[PDB]
């Protein structure tokens, strides 16, 4: 009793839109972003105190699906800028936790067990200022996100419009959260203030967003997910999607052109994050195949 | 030519106030703090901004603190501690908002936000107003002719409301509200910002309306109205009613959230607009109460 395959995936624009993205990203930034090169034994300070974070909830979680969810902080961060290498790893356990969490079935969500670890994380390897700050944001996502899942307000907000939409996304992708989290890294006064205000999570949401959107369209529509813009256009309908994209392309440039005039090394973080993140999303089994030991949900 | 809003401020007016009675319908309600009460959320403004030695009168405070007796929601308060902290933090931020930058002293001003916050707070409470309020007095001393401001404001309505959402306030005021209800999902929303981005629309496109001719006059740029051509009559009635459809499509998604929750947001957009034409700050462009502090 067929429903409407011809919506189901964006499978047929995947080489298109790569292109487009990338032709955009090379007129409008340029600088390749560029990955850190952790060690194994380093490796295994962060991924060993992964599981310790989600190890109470009862859920293993392979190497293998903790790279698929670490790749993002090695991609989209900005190497040349670090000073807080402690921060640095903070923010790689608390994304891939969190990513976990993201995934979870909402029964294995429990706070009294999960927040605790999440204090943990921050307290080890933040001062005890920045420690406080990083754990707010933290709670804040895995409270948003749970909240959220099948929500009257998350309808409406992914029914109505792109700019609704993205409102929703400030939180719920999580970029809020990692420039609350990322700034210790970089010890930079203007960006900590962005980080704070959340201007920095406002500026970086759309570029980040379309381009998870599209890469994981197909695994979200196959598990009822709504969050995603692309609902928003007839996807089996090439010229509404085609109209849609580009806006979603403007959306990016403008972003990205006013990303310009915040001040040279705050600019370099934000555009490394938009940037890294296609490049991460790209490069990531995570978006290539619908459901996968790294990727299906985790369920209980 | 762009110099002025007045012809339309009979029409928009009237077109606000019917947008309002057919998407919210239900009209503010203003706190009537006692006497007591009144009392000390002035004093407690005057020991605030002395050590960056300026007088301010009653009546500029008054004129300040009716935001907050017109758009908070009175039927769903709890705790009129957190209410005098929000009139409190909402008038010395006001004024750090007037005061040409010489002026502004962070170590003579934070501590006096410090002791206001935990002073009417709890611990915890303290904190997040605190923060909320520091961040916004740093964000509006920085942006002063900062490029970022030059970028945001100029480009579209979409980065200049993105400015709007810390440099209003209201991020602020959602951060330093939530006690007022003790009501754990709207705390949820406002430490997530998302009760903030839900409301920056509203309370920015009124604002902008009515201190436009001030704004303008005095080299300030922030200020939605400055993106379009208010010489032409029929293009400002285009921006103007986008504008309009912006704030209609926020009403119309708030009303999904929780009962209580979407009362605080609507009151809070319907008080600003019923307490902005009813203060003297928002007619003219200089006079009593909104004369830059120097
Ligand atoms: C805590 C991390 C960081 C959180 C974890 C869940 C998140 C919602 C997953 C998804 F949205 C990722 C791949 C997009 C990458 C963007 C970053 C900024 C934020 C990404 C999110
Ligand atoms: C925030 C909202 C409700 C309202 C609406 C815009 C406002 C009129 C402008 C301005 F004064 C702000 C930045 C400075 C003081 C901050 C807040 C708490 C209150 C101040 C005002
Ligand atoms: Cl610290
Ligand atoms: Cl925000
Ligand atoms: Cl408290
Ligand atoms: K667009
Ligand atoms: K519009
Ligand atoms: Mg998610
Ligand atoms: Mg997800
Ligand atoms: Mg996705
Ligand atoms: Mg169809
Ligand atoms: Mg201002
Ligand atoms: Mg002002
Ligand atoms: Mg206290
Ligand atoms: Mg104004
Ligand atoms: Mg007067």
Redesign the pocket.
Known sequence: GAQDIGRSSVRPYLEECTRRFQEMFDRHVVTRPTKVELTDAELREVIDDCNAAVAPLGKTVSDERWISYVGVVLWSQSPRHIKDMEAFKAVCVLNCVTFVW?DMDPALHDFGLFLPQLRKICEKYYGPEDAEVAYEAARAFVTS?HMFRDSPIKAALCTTSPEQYFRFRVT???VDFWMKMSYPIYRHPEFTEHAKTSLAARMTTRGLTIVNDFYSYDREVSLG?I?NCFRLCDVSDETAFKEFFQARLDDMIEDIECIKAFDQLTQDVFLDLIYGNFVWTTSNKRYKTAVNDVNSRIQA
């Open positions: 993201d996100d719920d992708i999580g997910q969050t």
